[PDB]
């Protein structure tokens, strides 16, 4: 049902790729047509590296299935259902009718369950080798233009799922907190009544010769 | 058998590409169908440069076999088994039936043993020209952002095979030990009760003008 | 497939008997013949207490199944498939042909799924009541010969899964760190340029009357 | 040939279970009847834990072969050679005639080769998990009677392979060198012109109340 | 013969692409089938730029031969041997039978000798325009991380042909000698009893702000 799909998405929305989703997946799916499961796959939030590695793994295993099983056919009378092939197990190249015709036919060749095993194993691989990134993990290096940082922060911000108040509040907090000590000092040098442009301009002053000269002079001044 | 496969994997798991695996390979395999051996190949831990050079060598030698042996056929009556070709020796393009049909047929043309010789020689080439990397070998250059270092260390960490306690213990130890003297000093400047974020922020302060100015000032201060 | 087996082994290799393996197991298996599953059982790393308790639980439950279900047969004409018995559910005493003949026959009596439930429950019991041991957990008591300790440490070391550099590095670190304060003092009494033998001999001197006399005398010296 | 057997023994005599014997084994054997190979097994120097683990592994793998392959026979006319069984692959229960009759018959079912693979894998397991002990590794604990030590040393001495001069020379050297500092001091308290009995008696004095009292008194004396 | 091939390889092993190999080539080959010569080509140590330029030159000259000689055929009765084409002169696209059939046929069209002339000219071009690199020629620039240098040195080391003692001896010597004066000073600042890791760490300290500040301070100190 659609609510099951939304439920899956809800399971994916949080605790993403924690050692939870695999059994929840296997427990929620309980078998499906390869198309419906491929839909249950593609209906997610559209992750990049995860789904990349997913299609990779699935494709490789499909190729392995293709290699291991030649399953030559013909010249038998076209009265039978042929046989599933590694590319056929995928949602592509196949139709629901023959799929039901397969799953219904006996012996019960489990193409969908095998695909489920495949996507499960792949999902496990992803769970192991994938490390997600949050907005709190965004920080600027030792020296970079603040423009790229704020741009990166905003573009990264809109990618994260949250409310508006949570968004702009976190924007404020993380933006002022996660800045480099230098820029942070230059930002905190004045009262927090300034807008973004002012801080950006204050940060635009950074990186220039006058900055380094001023800091170096001040350093040698307080030192000597 | 599967345990033989797992045993091979176990032999590959440690002492990887030491002057051990070649005879152990030849001694464990004791001949196989090209498909089963190709499986015994692809069933490994999924190394990159090794298997790259492997497929490279195999492909080249296959091409050499193709070039050296034209072995034209026809117009003989299709009552015989044809002849193996360089691309046929590989697991691809071939089926187990004709392979057994070949190995069983006399004179005993050894396609699998030749492929074994090929993969052996290739594996030797790999053994010679491949230098593996451990987690202990991970170190940061003279000046780099600590973010890339910790990210590299973690992503490199999860790639290495070990236990959880061993993992995070080694994480702690190698992370604090393998740091640059500067960052290491900045890290050891405070008691080791801080989390990763604190050290990251302390390392985020590095690379800026204030840092260099402070160190330079301190240097000229202790000098003059 | 073999890769599924290696995948299971990989799942067992780390996070062993954490609240992960049960759903992963049930999700990866998706049902199997009792023989293939018994293979999937015996193909593991060869744990002792776990598999012990496993065979125990399975045997007990099998006995319970034997007791609860007399299922007397005869004198029916030998045209039917008989019925599964508790000892028959196990991989032993049974053949794949009749097993497929059973699973294929209707009503679909689920012997393999029941065995899966059994091994699952047993695996859960193991997950609950089993505490694994690492190399870091190895420590010598208040007074023992260092020989037994280093022997235990080495024999315990080779049992743990890791790389060579990781092995000998951990060997060094854990060996020097996990020693008793006394022996550790006697070990750190000299520069860490000595080999194992020197430290062993230094530790061989411990426990004798001269040692206790020296320490006691020194104690009474610094006291009085 | 016998010289091949003696050569194998010679290969076993030194570098025992180093990462050498496996290729040398597989290369020297070049296939054999299970009886002749079982002889090549039992003809060794009669090691304990190694051969123990060997028979263990072989028996387990044999049981696995028994389980995996029911290979039911009958009611076929007794004109054929039956089929090898896991217990049959071993030197026991089988005769050379049927073995040659098997290996000669086609398709060439490789029983001896499989047994070779088995003993190879087992030998690898032994190579990994077995740590041999030398005479140099013999040392007395913190406090033990010297009688047990010299007895252990002698009984351990005769077990090691060497010449007579090498034996008694090593006896002298290792006996005087590997002793505990206390006993070593008591031994070196006099010129090395004494026989074993004198040192034994001198060591017999150790462990008593007078000894500990004397050492403790001397300690407190040099201290206070 | 094979020894002639190994002899060629031996001629290539040293004095590579010196004004020697061309006449030695022409004198050793003394004509060959294009396949055997193409083998005599590909059987070398697998050089990169040389063989690159070689295939380049050969391909270009082949294209020139293709352009200059249209040599249209047909509709002659297929009783004759056709004619060699630029792509046919190469080992590819041709078989030994027709090649011998050509060389044997009169007038003696010299395809192999022409190919020999081609590869000779190409080899001359290579001799002129190719400058080989040794391990002694490996040096680090004014400022680079020592990691890349040692990695480059090792990977370059294993590429060079020499013995083990020669290898590691040259490793030591060239590694300590070819280092930059700065790093060399930092390396020679301590006794040459340190391992690679220590020097690497000492070199890891280089490039940072503290380094430059220290050197600059010391400079201004000794200056002022």
Coordinates of N, CA, C and O in Angstrom, one line a residue, chain A residues 16-160:
Chain A
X16 N 19.0 6.7 9.2 CA 19.2 6.3 7.9 C 20.5 5.4 7.9 O 21.5 5.7 8.4
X17 N 20.3 4.2 7.4 CA 21.4 3.2 7.2 C 22.0 2.8 8.5 O 23.2 2.5 8.6
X18 N 21.3 2.9 9.6 CA 21.7 2.4 10.9 C 21.3 0.9 10.9 O 20.5 0.4 10.0
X19 N 21.9 0.1 11.8 CA 21.5 -1.4 11.8 C 20.1 -1.6 12.2 O 19.8 -2.3 13.1
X20 N 19.2 -1.0 11.5 CA 17.7 -1.1 11.7 C 17.0 -1.4 10.4 O 16.2 -2.3 10.3
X21 N 17.2 -0.6 9.4 CA 16.5 -0.6 8.1 C 16.5 -2.0 7.4 O 15.6 -2.3 6.7
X22 N 17.6 -2.8 7.6 CA 17.6 -4.1 6.9 C 16.5 -5.0 7.4 O 15.7 -5.5 6.5
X23 N 16.4 -5.3 8.7 CA 15.2 -6.2 9.1 C 13.9 -5.5 8.9 O 12.9 -6.2 8.6
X24 N 13.8 -4.2 9.1 CA 12.6 -3.4 8.9 C 12.2 -3.6 7.4 O 11.0 -3.8 7.1
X25 N 13.2 -3.5 6.6 CA 13.0 -3.7 5.1 C 12.4 -5.1 4.9 O 11.3 -5.2 4.3
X26 N 13.2 -6.1 5.2 CA 12.8 -7.5 5.0 C 11.4 -7.8 5.7 O 10.6 -8.6 5.2
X27 N 11.1 -7.1 6.8 CA 9.9 -7.3 7.5 C 8.7 -6.5 6.9 O 7.6 -6.9 7.1
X28 N 9.0 -5.4 6.3 CA 8.0 -4.6 5.7 C 7.6 -5.1 4.3 O 6.4 -5.1 4.0
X29 N 8.6 -5.4 3.6 CA 8.4 -5.9 2.2 C 7.6 -7.2 2.1 O 6.6 -7.3 1.5
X30 N 8.2 -8.2 2.8 CA 7.6 -9.5 2.8 C 7.3 -10.1 1.4 O 6.3 -10.7 1.2
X31 N 8.2 -9.8 0.6 CA 8.2 -10.2 -0.8 C 7.4 -9.2 -1.7 O 6.5 -8.6 -1.2
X32 N 7.8 -9.0 -2.9 CA 7.2 -8.1 -3.8 C 7.6 -8.5 -5.3 O 8.6 -9.2 -5.5
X33 N 6.8 -8.0 -6.2 CA 7.2 -8.1 -7.6 C 8.5 -7.2 -7.8 O 8.6 -6.2 -7.1
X34 N 9.4 -7.6 -8.7 CA 10.6 -6.8 -8.9 C 10.3 -5.3 -9.3 O 11.1 -4.5 -8.9
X35 N 9.2 -5.1 -10.0 CA 8.9 -3.8 -10.4 C 8.4 -2.9 -9.2 O 8.9 -1.8 -9.0
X36 N 7.5 -3.5 -8.4 CA 7.0 -2.8 -7.2 C 8.1 -2.6 -6.2 O 8.1 -1.5 -5.5
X37 N 9.1 -3.5 -6.1 CA 10.2 -3.3 -5.2 C 11.2 -2.3 -5.8 O 11.8 -1.5 -5.0
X38 N 11.4 -2.4 -7.1 CA 12.2 -1.4 -7.8 C 11.6 0.0 -7.6 O 12.3 1.0 -7.5
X39 N 10.3 0.1 -7.5 CA 9.6 1.3 -7.2 C 9.8 1.7 -5.7 O 10.1 2.8 -5.4
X40 N 9.7 0.7 -4.9 CA 10.0 0.9 -3.4 C 11.5 1.3 -3.3 O 11.8 1.9 -2.3
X41 N 12.3 1.0 -4.2 CA 13.7 1.4 -4.3 C 13.7 2.9 -4.7 O 14.2 3.8 -3.9
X42 N 13.3 3.2 -5.9 CA 13.4 4.5 -6.5 C 12.5 5.6 -5.8 O 12.7 6.7 -6.1
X43 N 11.6 5.1 -5.0 CA 10.7 6.1 -4.3 C 11.3 6.8 -3.1 O 10.6 7.6 -2.5
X44 N 12.5 6.4 -2.8 CA 13.2 7.0 -1.7 C 13.6 8.5 -1.9 O 13.2 9.1 -2.9
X45 N 14.3 9.1 -0.9 CA 14.6 10.5 -1.0 C 15.6 10.9 -2.0 O 16.0 12.1 -2.1
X46 N 16.1 9.9 -2.8 CA 17.0 10.2 -3.9 C 18.4 10.4 -3.4 O 19.1 11.4 -3.8
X47 N 18.9 9.5 -2.6 CA 20.3 9.6 -2.1 C 21.2 9.3 -3.3 O 20.8 8.7 -4.3
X48 N 22.5 9.7 -3.2 CA 23.4 9.6 -4.3 C 24.4 8.4 -4.2 O 24.2 7.4 -4.9
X49 N 25.3 8.5 -3.2 CA 26.3 7.4 -3.1 C 25.7 6.1 -2.7 O 26.1 5.0 -3.2
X50 N 24.7 6.1 -1.8 CA 24.0 4.9 -1.4 C 23.4 4.2 -2.6 O 23.8 3.1 -2.9
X51 N 22.5 4.9 -3.3 CA 21.8 4.3 -4.4 C 22.8 4.0 -5.6 O 22.6 3.0 -6.3
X52 N 23.9 4.8 -5.7 CA 25.0 4.5 -6.6 C 25.5 3.1 -6.3 O 25.5 2.2 -7.1
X53 N 26.1 2.9 -5.1 CA 26.6 1.6 -4.6 C 25.5 0.5 -4.7 O 25.9 -0.6 -5.0
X54 N 24.3 0.9 -4.5 CA 23.2 0.0 -4.6 C 23.1 -0.6 -6.0 O 23.1 -1.8 -6.2
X55 N 22.9 0.3 -7.0 CA 22.8 -0.1 -8.4 C 24.1 -0.8 -8.8 O 24.0 -1.8 -9.6
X56 N 25.2 -0.4 -8.4 CA 26.5 -1.0 -8.6 C 26.4 -2.5 -8.2 O 26.6 -3.4 -9.0
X57 N 26.2 -2.7 -6.9 CA 26.1 -4.1 -6.3 C 25.1 -4.9 -7.0 O 25.4 -6.1 -7.4
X58 N 23.9 -4.4 -7.2 CA 22.8 -5.1 -7.9 C 23.3 -5.5 -9.3 O 23.0 -6.7 -9.7
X59 N 23.9 -4.6 -10.0 CA 24.3 -4.8 -11.4 C 25.4 -5.9 -11.4 O 25.4 -6.8 -12.2
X60 N 26.4 -5.8 -10.5 CA 27.4 -6.8 -10.4 C 26.9 -8.2 -10.1 O 27.2 -9.2 -10.7
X61 N 26.0 -8.3 -9.1 CA 25.4 -9.5 -8.7 C 24.5 -10.1 -9.8 O 24.5 -11.3 -10.1
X62 N 23.9 -9.2 -10.6 CA 23.1 -9.6 -11.7 C 24.0 -10.2 -12.8 O 23.7 -11.2 -13.4
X63 N 25.2 -9.5 -13.0 CA 26.2 -10.0 -14.0 C 26.7 -11.4 -13.5 O 26.9 -12.3 -14.3
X64 N 26.9 -11.5 -12.2 CA 27.3 -12.8 -11.6 C 26.2 -13.9 -11.9 O 26.6 -15.0 -12.3
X65 N 25.0 -13.5 -11.7 CA 23.9 -14.4 -12.0 C 23.8 -14.8 -13.5 O 23.6 -15.9 -13.8
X66 N 24.1 -13.8 -14.3 CA 24.2 -14.0 -15.8 C 25.3 -15.0 -16.1 O 25.1 -15.9 -16.9
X67 N 26.4 -14.8 -15.5 CA 27.6 -15.6 -15.8 C 27.4 -17.1 -15.3 O 27.6 -18.0 -16.0
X68 N 26.9 -17.2 -14.0 CA 26.8 -18.5 -13.4 C 25.7 -19.4 -14.0 O 25.8 -20.6 -14.0
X69 N 24.7 -18.7 -14.6 CA 23.6 -19.4 -15.2 C 23.3 -19.1 -16.6 O 22.7 -18.1 -17.0
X70 N 23.9 -19.9 -17.5 CA 23.7 -19.7 -19.0 C 22.2 -19.9 -19.4 O 21.7 -19.2 -20.2
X71 N 21.6 -21.0 -18.8 CA 20.2 -21.3 -19.0 C 19.7 -21.2 -20.4 O 18.7 -20.6 -20.7
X72 N 20.5 -21.8 -21.3 CA 20.1 -21.8 -22.7 C 18.7 -22.3 -23.0 O 18.3 -23.3 -22.3
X73 N 18.0 -21.7 -23.9 CA 16.6 -22.1 -24.2 C 16.4 -22.4 -25.7 O 17.2 -21.9 -26.5
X74 N 15.4 -23.1 -26.1 CA 15.1 -23.5 -27.4 C 15.7 -24.8 -27.8 O 16.7 -25.3 -27.2
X75 N 15.2 -25.4 -28.9 CA 14.0 -25.1 -29.7 C 12.7 -25.7 -29.1 O 12.0 -26.3 -29.9
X76 N 12.5 -25.4 -27.8 CA 11.2 -25.9 -27.2 C 10.0 -25.1 -27.8 O 10.2 -23.9 -28.1
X77 N 8.9 -25.7 -27.9 CA 7.7 -25.1 -28.3 C 7.3 -23.9 -27.4 O 7.4 -24.1 -26.2
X78 N 7.0 -22.7 -27.9 CA 6.8 -21.6 -27.1 C 5.5 -21.7 -26.2 O 4.6 -20.9 -26.3
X79 N 5.4 -22.8 -25.5 CA 4.2 -23.0 -24.6 C 4.5 -22.7 -23.1 O 3.6 -22.6 -22.3
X80 N 5.8 -22.6 -22.8 CA 6.3 -22.4 -21.5 C 6.7 -20.9 -21.2 O 6.6 -20.1 -22.1
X81 N 7.1 -20.6 -20.0 CA 7.3 -19.3 -19.5 C 8.8 -18.8 -19.7 O 9.2 -17.8 -19.1
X82 N 9.6 -19.6 -20.4 CA 11.1 -19.3 -20.5 C 11.7 -19.4 -19.1 O 11.2 -20.3 -18.3
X83 N 12.7 -18.6 -18.8 CA 13.3 -18.7 -17.5 C 13.8 -17.3 -17.1 O 14.2 -16.5 -18.0
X84 N 13.8 -16.9 -15.8 CA 14.4 -15.6 -15.5 C 15.9 -15.5 -15.7 O 16.6 -16.4 -15.5
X85 N 16.3 -14.3 -16.2 CA 17.7 -14.0 -16.4 C 18.1 -12.8 -15.5 O 17.3 -12.0 -15.1
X86 N 19.4 -12.7 -15.2 CA 19.9 -11.7 -14.3 C 19.4 -10.3 -14.5 O 19.1 -9.5 -13.6
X87 N 19.3 -10.0 -15.8 CA 18.8 -8.7 -16.2 C 17.2 -8.6 -16.1 O 16.6 -7.6 -16.0
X88 N 16.6 -9.8 -16.1 CA 15.2 -10.0 -16.0 C 14.7 -9.8 -14.6 O 13.6 -9.3 -14.3
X89 N 15.6 -10.2 -13.6 CA 15.2 -10.1 -12.2 C 15.0 -8.7 -11.8 O 14.2 -8.4 -10.9
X90 N 15.7 -7.8 -12.5 CA 15.6 -6.3 -12.3 C 14.2 -5.9 -12.8 O 13.6 -6.5 -13.6
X91 N 13.8 -4.7 -12.3 CA 12.5 -4.2 -12.7 C 12.4 -3.9 -14.2 O 11.3 -4.0 -14.8
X92 N 13.6 -3.6 -14.8 CA 13.6 -3.3 -16.2 C 13.5 -4.6 -17.0 O 13.8 -5.7 -16.5
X93 N 13.1 -4.5 -18.3 CA 13.1 -5.6 -19.2 C 12.0 -6.7 -18.9 O 11.8 -7.6 -19.6
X94 N 11.3 -6.5 -17.8 CA 10.2 -7.4 -17.3 C 8.9 -6.7 -17.1 O 8.8 -5.5 -16.9
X95 N 7.8 -7.5 -17.2 CA 6.5 -7.0 -17.0 C 5.8 -7.8 -15.9 O 6.2 -8.9 -15.5
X96 N 4.8 -7.1 -15.3 CA 4.1 -7.7 -14.1 C 3.4 -9.0 -14.4 O 3.3 -9.8 -13.5
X97 N 2.9 -9.1 -15.6 CA 2.1 -10.2 -15.9 C 2.9 -11.5 -15.9 O 2.5 -12.5 -15.2
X98 N 4.0 -11.6 -16.6 CA 4.8 -12.8 -16.6 C 5.4 -13.0 -15.2 O 5.7 -14.1 -14.8
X99 N 5.7 -11.9 -14.4 CA 6.2 -12.0 -13.1 C 5.2 -12.7 -12.2 O 5.6 -13.7 -11.5
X100 N 4.0 -12.3 -12.2 CA 2.9 -13.0 -11.4 C 2.8 -14.4 -12.0 O 2.6 -15.4 -11.3
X101 N 2.9 -14.5 -13.3 CA 2.8 -15.8 -14.0 C 3.9 -16.7 -13.5 O 3.7 -17.9 -13.5
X102 N 5.1 -16.1 -13.2 CA 6.2 -16.9 -12.7 C 6.0 -17.3 -11.2 O 5.9 -18.5 -10.9
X103 N 5.8 -16.3 -10.4 CA 5.6 -16.5 -8.9 C 4.4 -17.5 -8.7 O 4.5 -18.2 -7.7
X104 N 3.4 -17.4 -9.5 CA 2.2 -18.3 -9.4 C 2.5 -19.7 -9.8 O 2.1 -20.6 -9.2
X105 N 3.4 -19.8 -10.9 CA 3.7 -21.1 -11.4 C 4.5 -21.9 -10.4 O 5.2 -21.3 -9.6
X106 N 4.5 -23.2 -10.6 CA 5.2 -24.1 -9.7 C 6.2 -25.0 -10.5 O 5.9 -25.4 -11.6
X107 N 7.4 -25.3 -9.9 CA 7.9 -24.9 -8.6 C 8.0 -23.4 -8.4 O 8.4 -22.7 -9.4
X108 N 7.8 -22.9 -7.2 CA 7.8 -21.4 -7.0 C 9.2 -20.8 -7.0 O 9.9 -20.6 -6.0
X109 N 9.7 -20.6 -8.2 CA 11.0 -19.9 -8.4 C 10.9 -18.5 -7.8 O 10.1 -17.6 -8.3
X110 N 11.7 -18.2 -6.8 CA 11.6 -16.9 -6.1 C 12.5 -15.8 -6.7 O 13.6 -15.5 -6.1
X111 N 12.1 -15.2 -7.8 CA 12.9 -14.1 -8.4 C 12.9 -12.9 -7.5 O 13.9 -12.3 -7.2
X112 N 11.7 -12.5 -7.0 CA 11.6 -11.3 -6.1 C 12.3 -11.5 -4.8 O 12.9 -10.5 -4.3
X113 N 12.2 -12.7 -4.2 CA 12.9 -12.9 -3.0 C 14.4 -12.9 -3.2 O 15.1 -12.4 -2.3
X114 N 14.9 -13.4 -4.3 CA 16.3 -13.3 -4.6 C 16.7 -11.9 -4.8 O 17.8 -11.4 -4.3
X115 N 15.9 -11.1 -5.6 CA 16.2 -9.7 -5.7 C 16.1 -9.0 -4.4 O 16.9 -8.1 -4.1
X116 N 15.2 -9.4 -3.5 CA 15.2 -8.9 -2.1 C 16.4 -9.2 -1.4 O 17.0 -8.4 -0.6
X117 N 16.9 -10.4 -1.5 CA 18.2 -10.8 -0.9 C 19.3 -10.0 -1.4 O 20.2 -9.5 -0.6
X118 N 19.3 -9.8 -2.7 CA 20.3 -8.9 -3.4 C 20.3 -7.5 -2.8 O 21.4 -7.0 -2.4
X119 N 19.2 -6.8 -2.9 CA 19.1 -5.5 -2.4 C 19.3 -5.4 -0.9 O 19.8 -4.4 -0.4
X120 N 19.0 -6.5 -0.2 CA 19.2 -6.5 1.3 C 20.8 -6.5 1.5 O 21.3 -5.7 2.3
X121 N 21.5 -7.4 0.8 CA 22.9 -7.5 0.9 C 23.6 -6.2 0.5 O 24.5 -5.7 1.2
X122 N 23.1 -5.7 -0.6 CA 23.6 -4.4 -1.0 C 23.4 -3.3 0.0 O 24.2 -2.5 0.3
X123 N 22.2 -3.3 0.6 CA 21.8 -2.3 1.6 C 22.6 -2.5 2.8 O 23.0 -1.5 3.5
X124 N 23.0 -3.7 3.1 CA 23.9 -4.0 4.2 C 25.3 -3.4 3.9 O 25.9 -2.8 4.8
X125 N 25.8 -3.7 2.7 CA 27.1 -3.1 2.3 C 27.0 -1.6 2.4 O 28.0 -1.0 2.9
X126 N 26.0 -1.0 2.0 CA 25.8 0.4 2.1 C 25.8 0.8 3.6 O 26.5 1.8 4.0
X127 N 25.0 0.1 4.4 CA 25.0 0.4 5.8 C 26.4 0.3 6.5 O 26.7 1.2 7.3
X128 N 27.2 -0.6 6.0 CA 28.6 -0.7 6.5 C 29.5 0.4 6.0 O 30.1 1.1 6.8
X129 N 29.5 0.6 4.7 CA 30.5 1.5 4.1 C 30.0 2.9 3.8 O 30.8 3.7 3.3
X130 N 28.8 3.3 4.2 CA 28.3 4.6 4.1 C 28.3 5.4 5.4 O 27.7 5.0 6.4
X131 N 28.8 6.6 5.3 CA 28.8 7.5 6.5 C 28.0 8.8 6.1 O 28.6 9.6 5.3
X132 N 26.8 9.0 6.6 CA 26.1 10.2 6.3 C 26.7 11.5 6.9 O 27.4 11.4 7.8
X133 N 26.3 12.6 6.3 CA 26.8 13.9 6.8 C 25.6 14.8 7.2 O 24.6 14.9 6.5
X134 N 25.7 15.5 8.3 CA 24.7 16.4 8.8 C 25.1 17.9 8.6 O 26.2 18.1 8.1
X135 N 24.3 18.8 9.0 CA 24.6 20.2 8.9 C 25.6 20.7 9.9 O 26.3 21.6 9.8
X136 N 25.6 20.0 11.1 CA 26.5 20.3 12.2 C 27.9 19.9 11.8 O 28.9 20.4 12.4
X137 N 28.1 19.0 10.8 CA 29.4 18.5 10.4 C 30.1 19.5 9.4 O 31.2 19.2 9.0
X138 N 29.4 20.5 9.1 CA 29.9 21.5 8.1 C 30.8 22.5 8.8 O 30.4 23.3 9.7
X139 N 32.1 22.6 8.4 CA 33.0 23.5 8.9 C 34.0 24.0 7.9 O 34.3 23.2 6.9
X140 N 34.5 25.2 8.0 CA 35.5 25.8 7.1 C 36.9 25.4 7.5 O 37.2 25.3 8.7
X141 N 37.8 25.2 6.5 CA 39.1 24.8 6.7 C 39.9 26.0 7.3 O 39.4 27.0 7.7
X142 N 41.3 25.8 7.4 CA 42.1 26.9 8.0 C 42.0 28.2 7.3 O 41.8 29.2 8.0
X143 N 42.1 28.3 6.0 CA 41.9 29.5 5.2 C 41.1 29.2 4.0 O 41.5 28.5 3.0
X144 N 39.8 29.8 3.9 CA 39.0 29.7 2.7 C 38.1 31.0 2.7 O 37.9 31.6 3.8
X145 N 37.7 31.4 1.5 CA 36.7 32.5 1.4 C 35.4 32.2 2.1 O 34.9 31.1 1.9
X146 N 34.9 33.1 2.9 CA 33.6 32.9 3.7 C 32.4 32.7 2.7 O 31.4 32.1 3.1
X147 N 32.6 33.3 1.5 CA 31.5 33.2 0.5 C 31.2 31.7 0.2 O 30.0 31.3 0.2
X148 N 32.2 30.9 -0.1 CA 32.1 29.5 -0.4 C 31.5 28.8 0.8 O 30.7 27.9 0.6
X149 N 31.9 29.2 2.0 CA 31.4 28.6 3.2 C 29.9 28.8 3.4 O 29.2 27.9 3.7
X150 N 29.5 30.1 3.3 CA 28.1 30.4 3.5 C 27.2 29.8 2.4 O 26.2 29.3 2.7
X151 N 27.8 29.8 1.2 CA 27.1 29.2 0.1 C 26.9 27.7 0.3 O 25.8 27.2 0.2
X152 N 28.0 27.1 0.7 CA 28.0 25.7 1.0 C 27.1 25.4 2.1 O 26.3 24.4 2.1
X153 N 27.1 26.2 3.1 CA 26.2 26.0 4.3 C 24.8 26.1 4.0 O 23.9 25.3 4.4
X154 N 24.4 27.1 3.2 CA 23.0 27.3 2.7 C 22.5 26.2 1.8 O 21.5 25.6 2.0
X155 N 23.4 25.9 0.8 CA 23.0 24.8 -0.1 C 22.9 23.5 0.6 O 22.1 22.6 0.3
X156 N 23.8 23.3 1.6 CA 23.8 22.1 2.5 C 22.6 22.2 3.4 O 22.0 21.2 3.8
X157 N 22.2 23.4 3.8 CA 21.1 23.6 4.7 C 19.8 23.1 4.1 O 19.0 22.3 4.6
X158 N 19.5 23.6 2.9 CA 18.3 23.3 2.2 C 18.2 21.8 1.9 O 17.1 21.3 1.6
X159 N 19.3 21.1 1.9 CA 19.3 19.7 1.6 C 18.8 18.9 2.8 O 18.3 17.8 2.7
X160 N 19.1 19.4 4.0 CA 18.7 18.8 5.3 C 17.2 18.9 5.5 O 16.6 20.0 5.2

